[PDB]
Design an enzyme around this catalytic site. Structure first.
Site, mmCIF file in Angstrom:
data_model
loop_
_atom_site.group_PDB
_atom_site.id
_atom_site.type_symbol
_atom_site.label_atom_id
_atom_site.label_comp_id
_atom_site.label_asym_id
_atom_site.label_seq_id
_atom_site.Cartn_x
_atom_site.Cartn_y
_atom_site.Cartn_z
ATOM 1 N N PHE A 140 34.330 8.018 24.070
ATOM 2 C CA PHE A 140 34.438 7.564 22.662
ATOM 3 C C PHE A 140 34.576 6.044 22.538
ATOM 4 C CE2 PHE A 140 36.430 11.843 22.815
ATOM 5 C CZ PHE A 140 35.549 12.515 21.971
ATOM 6 N N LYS A 183 34.602 -3.971 22.254
ATOM 7 C CA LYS A 183 34.790 -2.586 22.633
ATOM 8 C C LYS A 183 35.206 -1.757 21.428
ATOM 9 C CE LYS A 183 37.363 0.337 25.848
ATOM 10 N NZ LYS A 183 38.016 0.322 27.256
ATOM 11 N N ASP A 216 42.058 2.829 37.982
ATOM 12 C CA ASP A 216 40.591 2.985 37.937
ATOM 13 C C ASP A 216 39.889 1.839 38.698
ATOM 14 O OD1 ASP A 216 38.305 4.472 37.125
ATOM 15 O OD2 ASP A 216 38.502 3.926 34.973
ATOM 16 N N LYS A 262 37.607 0.410 41.223
ATOM 17 C CA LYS A 262 36.397 0.854 41.874
ATOM 18 C C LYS A 262 35.364 -0.229 41.619
ATOM 19 C CE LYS A 262 35.094 3.331 37.766
ATOM 20 N NZ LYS A 262 34.514 4.629 37.300
ATOM 21 N N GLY A 304 27.771 -0.926 27.873
ATOM 22 C CA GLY A 304 28.475 0.218 28.465
ATOM 23 C C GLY A 304 28.920 1.244 27.461
ATOM 24 N N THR A 334 37.417 8.176 39.301
ATOM 25 C CA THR A 334 36.170 8.658 39.902
ATOM 26 C C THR A 334 36.500 9.210 41.300
ATOM 27 O OG1 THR A 334 34.942 6.974 38.687
ATOM 28 C CG2 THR A 334 33.854 7.992 40.588
ATOM 29 N N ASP A 387 38.521 -2.793 32.296
ATOM 30 C CA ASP A 387 38.671 -1.398 31.913
ATOM 31 C C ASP A 387 40.057 -0.859 32.212
ATOM 32 O OD1 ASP A 387 38.323 1.214 31.058
ATOM 33 O OD2 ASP A 387 36.584 1.623 32.395
ATOM 34 N N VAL A 429 32.242 -11.019 30.488
ATOM 35 C CA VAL A 429 31.904 -11.323 31.897
ATOM 36 C C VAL A 429 30.390 -11.281 32.059
ATOM 37 C CG1 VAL A 429 34.064 -10.483 32.808
ATOM 38 C CG2 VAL A 429 32.117 -8.922 32.641
ATOM 39 N N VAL A 488 30.696 -0.575 24.315
ATOM 40 C CA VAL A 488 30.973 -2.006 24.523
ATOM 41 C C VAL A 488 29.693 -2.789 24.343
ATOM 42 C CG1 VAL A 488 31.802 -3.785 26.147
ATOM 43 C CG2 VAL A 488 32.836 -1.499 26.153
ATOM 44 N N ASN A 520 34.246 -1.580 38.088
ATOM 45 C CA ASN A 520 35.250 -2.326 37.326
ATOM 46 C C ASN A 520 35.672 -3.681 37.914
ATOM 47 O OD1 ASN A 520 35.298 -0.378 35.308
ATOM 48 N ND2 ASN A 520 36.837 0.856 36.383
HETATM 49 C C1 LIG Z 1 33.573 2.318 28.751
HETATM 50 C C2 LIG Z 1 33.565 0.779 28.891
HETATM 51 S S1 LIG Z 1 35.275 0.112 28.986
HETATM 52 C C3 LIG Z 1 35.293 -1.589 29.240
HETATM 53 N N1 LIG Z 1 34.198 -2.235 29.548
HETATM 54 C C4 LIG Z 1 34.318 -3.689 29.740
HETATM 55 C C5 LIG Z 1 35.508 -4.344 29.601
HETATM 56 C C6 LIG Z 1 35.288 -5.674 29.842
HETATM 57 N N2 LIG Z 1 33.964 -5.757 30.101
HETATM 58 N N3 LIG Z 1 33.404 -4.620 30.021
HETATM 59 C C7 LIG Z 1 32.000 -4.465 30.364
HETATM 60 C C8 LIG Z 1 31.429 -3.226 30.588
HETATM 61 C C9 LIG Z 1 30.094 -3.123 31.000
HETATM 62 C C10 LIG Z 1 29.355 -4.264 31.262
HETATM 63 C C11 LIG Z 1 29.962 -5.487 31.092
HETATM 64 CL CL1 LIG Z 1 29.097 -6.921 31.365
HETATM 65 C C12 LIG Z 1 31.267 -5.595 30.668
HETATM 66 C C13 LIG Z 1 36.733 -3.616 29.264
HETATM 67 O O1 LIG Z 1 37.845 -4.136 29.143
HETATM 68 N N4 LIG Z 1 36.535 -2.241 29.098
HETATM 69 C C14 LIG Z 1 32.688 0.441 30.088
HETATM 70 N N5 LIG Z 1 33.209 0.032 31.302
HETATM 71 O O2 LIG Z 1 31.492 0.537 29.974
#
Ligand SMILES: C[C@@H](Sc1nc2c(cnn2-c2cccc(Cl)c2)c(=O)[nH]1)C(N)=O
Ligand SMILES: C[C@@H](Sc1nc2c(cnn2-c2cccc(Cl)c2)c(=O)[nH]1)C(N)=O
Ligand SMILES: C[C@@H](Sc1nc2c(cnn2-c2cccc(Cl)c2)c(=O)[nH]1)C(N)=O
Ligand SMILES: C[C@@H](Sc1nc2c(cnn2-c2cccc(Cl)c2)c(=O)[nH]1)C(N)=O
Ligand SMILES: CC[C@H](C)[C@H](N)C(=O)O
Lengths: 265, 266, 261, 266
Positions: free
Chosen positions: B18, B36, B128, B130, B14, B169, B150, B85, B21, B133
């Site tokens: 800025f 992250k 957030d 949705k 993800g 969103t 997130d 996860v 992950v 998340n």
């Molecule tokens: C900008 C980031 S922030 C974020 N992503 C997380 C967290 C935990 N798992 N993931 C994540 C994001 C994308 C895919 C997967 Cl498998 C896990 C978190 O605490 N903040 C995002 N959602 O892509």
């Protein structure tokens, strides 16, 4: 780090030269662990980064039921903290029986041998096998865990390794004499452990460190009738094949698992 | 401590503005985590926003909420080692299921509600909530566990402090976000209403042909229970949603009330 | 009381008419328990009914029966700290069971009830919801909920209307004298459900159910019982008997060929 | 709630001025407890009862007695306490063949852990003496010590002088004898006296009359007579010497005592 956000620290269980081990409790679950704090060398005043990595890489690589499990790992400015599996049964020799029967001894011993067989098959020498580092988890024959990989090393053949380390009473003559080291040193130490298991006496221990080291270097020991009158010829042969000065003539780990004393359940 | 001494980085999961992950592996144990990476303003995320996210993650310990395992910080970046996860997004798992009963749906929803109940009992708004998340930790077990992720715009709500912002969103935000009115814990409950609507129907309640329509529909609370999507839906489930999609945040069902509502209790 | 000084209360697990049961955690140890809050009648459940339940729990010590750990009282409630069963209810799902797997659970229920009946205690509320597990091919069962359990003295008539309709003997439905035999009927009903996943007397309404129980109207429908030995059917047949004096007793049931094999 | 609805009373275990302690049995479970009946004021003041109770409520440690429940009517307070079935420590030691310094220090370390917990909460016991050091069950391989009787225990608040005359003369610090300010240090003196008795079977300050005893305590007049101490290590004597110190500011504290070599030697 966040180690204190996850684990509540408790009573001190052991101190080594630059390590302290405390009981701790995982905050989410209530599960108990051992936390091993290892002081880092900062010579703007410890253990070098390279020695800590060696210990950690060894722990990472080993997965065996008779060997301690590394659960988690943190680092702050002064220390590296290893969260380890907690052994709540205490040390071996503390379970306290003066000496043991050959059945009770062989059941513990077989577990140690399985552990060391796994290690040696990965070319890892423990180098610190002794009663204090054999822990029990609980029963007639409980489950043993080997601990403390603080001086364990990968042995590469054709690459000489010499060091002075271990606890004098339990070290092979090649340690005492500053001669090349390998997996064979662990087998000597298994011989010493076995002797103590059956007799409750240490085979080479003298009145001073100086005598102890002499006795080890010359292989001066006996089977005193005061300690060994309840001992089979087979058990004595098993020990005799391990307390051998020349490491190339000493019984290896696979040979020891196939020896008649161990094979006779 | 350098993050590269402890963690081996892998597949990217993800990217935000800025933050990136990635999946990583703890070198001592072989255990998998999410890392992250967050760029710091020295053009970056402000120190104040990073601390807020981190303090919130530090304070929360709940089985339905992502766990912060460790932190690293150098001059340019903050790295958060988080629980991995592996199960993917909830709604994606539901699109692999043949059918979905109201019983099976409410079992997932109850996990989200327990998570939010824990947050709200600490005066933390997520802001957030949705589908993206709401994750599953492992989708292969008999009853998968939901994890909220997130906390990038999460906030402690302090009484005697008005908090206003435009974030989230559009499709999923409460009318008080749309209208730039005071915000609190109630915004999460609206978003739970939207999620619930989508869970049962597979349609988004306020989504229009453009952002402009969507925001109008949210601000007027213009939605329906079209018989094409809702003919198999109980009166109870509709009442549960109706109590959350409420304009006045002071009249909207709270998290404790939602756990005590007959649809969830059943 | 000081119940909250010792136990941290958690998620609600069950509500009955004047009881609520929550998960709790012993603060010193981390050990988990079930806390059963029982509302006290204050005219500003009667004291006598609470004592009955408690005295029954005090007296019973058996591995297939729930253990009472601790007991507190404050102004509104009596709180029983009970052993926590973490395996859930029996019937959770396997649709129905094999005769071997069923008899292994059933034998545990029978041992439990044998202990109870040897102390002249009738449970009166035996049904799937009150058979809990702790974990395996055949795990350990615990009987729970002694909320209407009663000591039976012979030559002292006891009549009441209680229990869950589907599982009650005809002597409950007809307001006739009650005893230990009512539990045996309920064991017959549980056994039927174990093998088939269907309830033997359940009708389209409460009124039909009660009629079917009172007349003993049931069958072994081939849709549910084509996977059933003559022995298992005989076992059930000997329990679903209207006259409580002709119904198989607990000792007889442990000696029946289906259980012995 | 009436105590007699919940607990059946048995054997009397001890009597104080307005307290009686009996063995009792919880009616629901059969479990045994100690019941401490305390007459309320011609009684004990409400303030003193609350002090004892609040202190017991706050303490949870394996070497300290556990308060299980409370009952109160107009005339009495009943404390349901954990039952210690093993008797007084010193009484068990008088049944033992010998007593090594290793076996002695294992008992002493339990008392020290208990007092360390108390002192970390700023609670002084003020009544540490052999009668109040109990064993929970004397039949197990390693019996567990329990401190009892918090009847004069006090929270020590800095900037509040506390003076009192209490305790049993033989075991009290010189600051009690001299009516000087009291604190956590008084318990450490008493630990010194207990340790002396443990190793020798003699009381260090006991004179032919109370008057001599108080003189001996106030001047710190004691010795290590070779008749009693010839088998006693220099370390054990140093440990005692560091506790039997007049100036409470110079006396070894509880944390220091756990780190002293005699105790650390396992
Ligand atoms: C900008 C980031 S922030 C974020 N992503 C997380 C967290 C935990 N798992 N993931 C994540 C994001 C994308 C895919 C997967 Cl498998 C896990 C978190 O605490 N903040 C995002 N959602 O892509
Ligand atoms: C300095 C440490 S090194 C070490 N100690 C361990 C380990 C596992 N358990 N314990 C330990 C030490 C003392 C007491 C107890 Cl219960 C356990 C390990 O891997 N290294 C030592 N040998 O005391
Ligand atoms: C009102 C209660 S009475 C009751 N419930 C028990 C007992 C033991 N466990 N649980 C219980 C109830 C619900 C869920 C769970 Cl896990 C356990 C008991 O002795 N009486 C009920 N039947 O739900
Ligand atoms: C007047 C009481 S005060 C007291 N006694 C206790 C307590 C716990 N156990 N016992 C006790 C006393 C005598 C014998 C026994 Cl077995 C037990 C407590 O908290 N206060 C006394 N010291 O005799
Ligand atoms: C006789 C032994 C068998 C396995 C047991 N009664 C079942 O049913």
């Amino acid at each position: 780090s966040m180690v204190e956000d996850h684990y509540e620290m408790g009573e001190e269980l052991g101190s080594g030269q630059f390590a302290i081990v405390r009981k701790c409790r995982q905050k989410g679950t209530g599960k108990e662990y051992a936390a091993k704090f290892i002081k880092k060398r900062r010579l703007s005043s410890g253990v070098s980064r390279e020695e800590i990595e060696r210990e950690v890489n060894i722990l990472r690589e080993i997965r065996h039921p008779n060997i301690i499990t590394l659960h988690d790992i943190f680092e702050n400015k002064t220390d590296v903290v290893l969260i380890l599996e907690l052994v709540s049964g205490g040390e071996l020799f503390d379970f306290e029986k003066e000496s043991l029967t050959e059945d009770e001894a062989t059941q513990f011993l077989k577990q140690i041998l399985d552990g060391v067989h796994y290690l040696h098959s990965k070319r890892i020498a423990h180098f610190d096998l002794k009663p204090e580092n054999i822990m029990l988890l609980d029963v007639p024959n409980p489950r043993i865990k080997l601990i403390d990989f603080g001086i364990a090393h990968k042995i590469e053949a054709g690459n000489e390794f010499k060091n002075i380390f271990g606890t004098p009473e339990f070290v092979a003559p090649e340690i005492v004499n500053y001669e090349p080291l390998g997996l064979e040193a662990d087998m000597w130490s298994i011989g010493v452990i076995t002797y103590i298991l059956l007799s409750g006496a240490s085979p080479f221990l003298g009145e001073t460190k100086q005598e102890t080291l002499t006795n080890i270097s010359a292989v001066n020991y006996d089977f005193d009738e005061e300690y060994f009158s309840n001992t089979s010829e087979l058990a004595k042969d098993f020990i005799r094949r391990l307390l051998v000065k020349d490491p190339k003539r000493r019984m290896t780990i696979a040979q020891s698992l196939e020896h008649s004393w161990i094979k006779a359940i």
